[PDB]
C-alpha cells in the first residue's frame, strides 16, 4: 500500500482509477479522500464532460427559468 | 507541551509474577490484594563495595537508606498501585481501586525527592509490571481543576504528531505538514592524497655515529608528513618523553620548524635532558629552555 | 485581436528553517531552540503563500462547471479557430499555447502546483469550446448552442452596430479575424520580450532564492561562515558565541526572504484577481467597460494558458 | 506574540525580574539587552504581518464596497460579479467582521432545440429581427426573444428590411405578415 505520485511517496492511501471532485489536495493533480471505508488517492476530475450540440442552424432557447 | 521521561504509549510492559536494569527510569505497576509488595533495592551491584539505595514500606513506617557508611536515612487484584522512579532521585506514584492492565487514564502526583545522587543501573523488588521510560514529548491536557485528564504521545503515530503540531486534540479534515524527513548518513568517509613525504627520522634515528654531548648535532626536519607512530610505538627506546605536547597527539597537529639534535650521554645524566634541568650536560653542554617545546 | 498577459501564480516554495540555519548540526539546533517559535511561523507564512497560489489558479481557470468540447465539424461561419483550439496530436495544448510555453525559460524545497499544466489546458479548452459553441450563455446557466455567425451578430448588436452589418459583411469580417489571429502568432513567435510580465515573475523568484542561498556564505561577524569549522576549531564557550552570530544572521536572512515573498504574493494575488475578473466579464460575457478588454469595442475574448 | 515572551533569546531567563533580582547592573544590562533584542524583533514581525494582512483585508473591503454599490444599489451587467446567472438584485446581511450578500439571479432552466436562420426572404428582401431570433418548430417560423421561448408571428413590426436576398449566408423563406394590409382591405 505504497503509491509513488508526482508529489512524493503516499503511504497508507489506496490508489483508485476513478476521479472525483478534489476533497483533500495533495498536488500534481492528485487528491485524496475518506470514502470498509478507507483513504483513497485519485487524479482529480475537472468536471462532468459535456458537448454542446453545435450546428450551423440549431439554437437552444430556454422555455423556463429559476430564480436562484 | 513537555519534553520529559515518560512511558511510551502502548509499549510492551513486562509482566512478572529477578533483578532488572533501570536503564533510564522505571515505571512500576502492581495489581495487589495481599500486599506482598513492600520495597525496593536500587543500585549498580546491590552487593557491598558500592552504595545501593534501599526503601522499605513496613507496616507503619517508610525506612529509606543509602547504605554501613550510610549517607542518608529518611523515615515517614483491586489495588492498582503505580509508581515512577527517575533520576537526584524522584518517585511519583498513584493508587486506584480497579475492577490485566486497565484502559483509562490517570496522572501520577509526585511523592518524594531524594537528593542523593546515587549511581543506579539495576534494581529489584522486595516482596507486578515493569516498564521503562523514554525521553518523549507529551502534550498534556490540564483540565479546569488543573488535573491531567488526557495526554498525547507525540511519537506514537502520524495522528499524534499532527495533534502535537496543532497543539490540539481534535483535527479538522485536511493535510498538515507535520515534520521533516531526512535520510541519515549511513557512515563516514575520510579521504586524503597518498601519504608520501615523511620526515626522515631514518637519518636521525637510523644513523651510525652519535656525536658528542657538548658538541651535539642539530639537523632540520620540516616540509614533510612526519610519522609519529614509529618513535613512540617502538619499545626499543628506553626513554620517550615530551615536555610541551601530548606525545600521543603528534599525529594530528602541525609545526613550522622541527629540529633534531643528537648526542651521546651517560645513562645516569640522561635525566638531565629535560626543560628546567641542572648539571654539566644541562648547563655547560646543552641547556633546554624552561618552556622548551618538543620531545626527548 | 490584441493580447494581454497576466501573471496568476508564483512558485510554491518551502524552507526547512532548521536546515537552512543549523544545517545538520545539533549544537546549532539547541542554540536555535532559544529563539522560540520563529521557525514555525516562517513555515506558516510560506505555507499560506503556497495555498494561496493554488487558490489563484483555481479562481482564474476553474470557472466552468462542465468540460465542453468543440464538435468535430468546424463550420464556424467562416472563422478559423484552429490555432487556439487544442492540438489533438501533441500535451493537448493549442498552437499558441505551445508558443507561449516555449518562450518562457540547503533545506529549500519546491512544491508542485495542484493543477498540472495539462489540466489548465483542459480548462482553457473548455472555456474556449463553450464560448465558440454557446456564446455567453454557458457562463450564466446551461450552455445553449447558437450558430457562430449568429452569436457574432448578437455581439455586434452589443456594441451598437445593427446586426445586418455582420451578415452582409460576414466573409470580410471572418477574413479579418483569421488574419488577426495569424498576426498574433507572428508577434509572439518573433519577439520574446512580449512575455516579460510572466518571465519577470520567474526571474524574481529565482533571484530571491539565489540570494537566500548565497547568504549561507557570510560570516555575519563570526570567524567563518562554515558552521562545522567554527565548531571544530573553538571550545564550546566561544563556539557558542560565534554560532550565535551565525544564527542571528541566517535567521534574519530568512525573515527578509519571507517578508519579500509575502509582499510579492500580495502583488500576484492582486493580478490573479484581475485575471479572474477578466475571465468572467470578458471571456464569459461581452464587456461594456471601456478598455477593460483591449482597445476598441469589445466583441469576444479567448483564454490561453501560459507558464 | 505572547508566547515569544517565554523565550530566553540567549539570556539566562525569559523572566525579566529574575535577571533583575539575580544580577548587578553591569551584567543584567547584557542579559536584558539580549531579551530586548529578541522581543523587539518579535514585535516587528508581528507588526509586519499585521500590515500585510490589513492590506489584504482592505482589498476585500474595497471589493465589498464595490459590490454594495454596483450590486445592491443597482443592477449589474458584469458577469459573475454578482452571482452566477443574470443578476436581478442583491440584499446585504451584516456578519461578524464582514458582510454577506444574497444575490438573486435569473437562471434559464428548461430549453428546447429549434431550427434558426439569420434572416428571411420575403420579396427579394432580407428581414432581420428587431430584437430576438427567428426560430422554427419544424414547420413554421416565428420570432422570439432570446432568453425565454415566447414565439410571436413574424410581421413587419418584429423585423426590419435590409438589402436583398442574395448576400446573407443562411437566409430562408416565409411570409412576413403585414398587419396593415387587412385594415386596408377591410
Ligand atoms: C485554418 O487555418 C490553418 C492555418 O494554420 C490552415 O491550415 C493550413 O491549411 C493548408 C491547406 O488546407 C495546408 O497546406 C497547411 O499546411 C495548413 N497549415 C497548418 C498549420 O495546418 C487550415 O486549412 C485552415 N482551415 C481551413 C478550413 O482552411
Ligand atoms: C408549428 O407551427 C405551427 C404554426 O403554423 C403550429 O400550428 C398550429 O398549432 C396549433 C396547436 O397545435 C393549432 O391550434 C393551430 O391551428 C396550428 N396552425 C397551423 C397553421 O397549423 C404547430 O402546432 C407548430 N408545431 C408544434 C409542434 O407546436
Ligand atoms: C427562398 O425564397 C426565394 C424566393 O425569392 C427563392 O428564390 C428563388 O429560387 C428559385 C429556385 O431556387 C429561382 O428560380 C428563383 O429565381 C429565385 N428567386 C429569387 C428572387 O431569388 C429561394 O430559392 C428560396 N429558398 C429555398 C431554399 O428554396
Ligand atoms: C417552470 O418550472 C416550474 C417549476 O420550477 C413549473 O411549475 C412550471 O410549470 C414551469 N413552466 C412551464 C411553462 O413548464
Ligand atoms: C473539580 O473538582 C470538584 C470537586 O471538588 C468538582 O466539583 C468539579 O467538577 C471539578 N472540576 C472539573 C472540571 O471536573
Ligand atoms: C438538441 O439535440 C441534440 C442532438 O440532436 C441533443 O443532444 C440535445 O440534448 C438537444 N437539446 C435538448 C434541449 O434536448
Ligand atoms: C450548414 O451545414 C450543413 C451540413 O449538413 C450544410 O449542408 C449547409 O449548407 C450549411 N449551411 C450553411 C448556410 O452553410
Author numbering:
A (entry chain B): 641 to 675, 689 to 721
B (entry chain B): 50 to 66, 82 to 131, 164 to 172, 186 to 196, 200 to 211, 215 to 242, 265 to 433
C (entry chain C): 722 to 811, 813 to 827, 856 to 1057
D (entry chain B): 962 to 1147
Give me lines lifted from the publication on this model.
The viral surface spike (S) protein is a key target for prophylactic measures as it is critical in the viral life cycle and the primary target of neutralizing antibodies. S is a large, trimeric glycoprotein that mediates both binding to host cell receptors and fusion of virus and host cell membranes, through its S1 and S2 subunits, respectively. In the prefusion state, the S-protein’s RBD domains alternate between open (‘up’) and closed (‘down’) conformations. The receptor-binding site, which can bind to human angiotensin-converting enzyme 2 (ACE2), is transiently exposed in the ‘up’ conformation.
In addition, A942P was selected for its strong enhancement of protein yields. These mutations were combined with hinge loop prolines resulting in two combos, a quadruple mutant S-closed + Fd containing D614N + A892P + A942P + V987P and a quintuple mutant S-closed + Fd + K986P. All combos displayed higher thermal stability with only a single Tm50 at about 66 °C and decreased levels of ACE2 and antibody binding compared to S-2P control. The S-closed+Fd quadruple mutant was then imaged by cryo-EM. A 2-steps 3D classification illustrates that out of 833,000 classified particles, ~80% was closed with all RBDs in the down state and 38% was categorized into a well-defined closed class while ~20% showed 1 RBD-up. Further processing of the 320,000 closed conformation particles allowed us to obtain a 2.8 Å electron potential map for the closed conformation and a 3.0 Å electron potential map for the 1 RBD-up (one up) conformation. The stabilizing mutations and presence of K986, which interacts with Asp427 in the RBD of the neighboring monomer and Glu748 in S2, allow the S trimer to maintain predominantly the closed prefusion configuration.
